[PDB]
Design a protein around this ligand. Sequence first.
Ligand SMILES: N=C(N)c1cc(-c2cccc(NC(=O)C3(Oc4ccc(Cl)cc4)CCC(F)(F)CC3)c2)cs1
Ligand SMILES: N=C(N)c1cc(-c2cccc(NC(=O)C3(Oc4ccc(Cl)cc4)CCC(F)(F)CC3)c2)cs1
Lengths: 236, 236, 5, 5
Amino acid sequence: GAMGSMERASLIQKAKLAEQAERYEDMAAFMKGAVEKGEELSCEERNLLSVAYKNVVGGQRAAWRVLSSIEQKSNEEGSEEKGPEVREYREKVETELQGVCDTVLGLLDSHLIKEAGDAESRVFYLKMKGDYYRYLAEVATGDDKKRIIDSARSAYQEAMDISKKEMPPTNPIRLGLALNFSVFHYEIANSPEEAISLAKTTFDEAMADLHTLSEDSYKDSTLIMQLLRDNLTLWT
Amino acid sequence: GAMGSMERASLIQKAKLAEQAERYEDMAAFMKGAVEKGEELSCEERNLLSVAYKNVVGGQRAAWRVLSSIEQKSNEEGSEEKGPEVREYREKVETELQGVCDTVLGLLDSHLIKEAGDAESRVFYLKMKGDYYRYLAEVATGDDKKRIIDSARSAYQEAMDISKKEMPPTNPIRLGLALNFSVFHYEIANSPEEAISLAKTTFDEAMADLHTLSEDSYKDSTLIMQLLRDNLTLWT
Amino acid sequence: FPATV
Amino acid sequence: FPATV
Ligand SMILES: N=C(N)c1cc(-c2cccc(NC(=O)C3(Oc4ccc(Cl)cc4)CCC(F)(F)CC3)c2)cs1
Ligand SMILES: N=C(N)c1cc(-c2cccc(NC(=O)C3(Oc4ccc(Cl)cc4)CCC(F)(F)CC3)c2)cs1
């Protein structure tokens, strides 16, 4: 690691600076360096890690979608052959995306998940593991696609089981996990009914627990509840 | 060059795909590969090159400005010492920006400018040369700052001299050159009166030539004229 | 696309 | 910042 010579605290400081500068590739590299120091991550540090890679892979995914759409059109009945370039470049972006996902999954496997004992850390990391297998699934087409899907499902399921036992229904990590696992069902697993059921049950159980929250906790929980509702409106 | 094995036409095709995907670093690398094939660039190709690097360096400049602002505040009377990290990271971004500028200036010097004989190509490239020295000037602080400023000024001046002899006053390249040279005067050369004079004279001479244009040419020229007016409104 | 966080 | 193109 090229961050091996930098202090852990300096890496965290520079990750925050990179965030302010919207330099998310740098932010991700700094937080990878911090993880590789071997210490567990605090709550703030876990979110710096997740924010950085979510932005990096999110940009890759958007680019992949543009290129895949162009590629499909080049393959419709009537299209003028344009050669291998669209496929090649889509493949280039795809390989870079897979590399970022493998990097994140590698950090979770070495050794963030195995040292995560508290619900807030363990659920957070297992949600990330589901998310990055889901992004691999979005581009998968080979002998491995079912196995990638099952890896996402398995990570999400373990996170769900812990979250239901150890967190209140309004916990934003629990809510975001359910939101994303619901999207997994709809978009990856061809299970729209499961997606809708999960979003609705999550929303209703959160609604019933809002009365326990402070104003600031209420704001966070209702924001993600609104995303659940948004998806349900998209799907019904 | 890692693009040495790819066809020129494939590089141009992939630059256009990268643009559609908002992958401007890739776009710039593809167009650098195309320039390094050694052939002159067509009008479309010149604009692909400029669009790519303008987006890359524009993002670097925005990040540098964020970090420089944080750094200045850390140095105000009353600030808590936070160590070398803000300076280090600003320096990192600055060095990467300088590298991109040097790359573009290198392409112009080897050998785009020397082979550019038509006004539309030669003015276009000399404007780029002024622009990328201007971006170097924005971050310069050493023994070289005056010389960087004079290099920008010299490139802009040669472009201006050609444009006034060889292009109509509504030509969008001529207009954009004047817009940017005016900004150079205001922001780099500490010559706001020159900046204002140049913008106003450029605007008025363009106004008087609009009657010669088609509807589509009119649209392009008046768009950049509006940018001249916008700056004049900012400065007066 | 649907919302995720 | 002022406009450039
Ligand atoms: N960016 C930075 N420098 C910093 C961010 C933080 C910080 C602090 C507290 C909470 C969070 N965030 C979250 O717990 C999650 O994200 C949320 C999203 C929306 C809402 Cl309304 C609430 C939470 C919950 C859902 C998710 F999917 F698991 C992802 C994490 C972050 C400290 S520093
Ligand atoms: N992006 C792509 N794939 C493609 C772009 C083109 C193309 C085609 C014609 C003109 C231009 N552009 C310009 O001549 C400039 O830019 C303009 C900006 C605004 C306006 Cl209203 C008009 C022109 C003039 C000012 C400047 F500073 F010298 C920079 C060049 C580009 C073909 S393909």
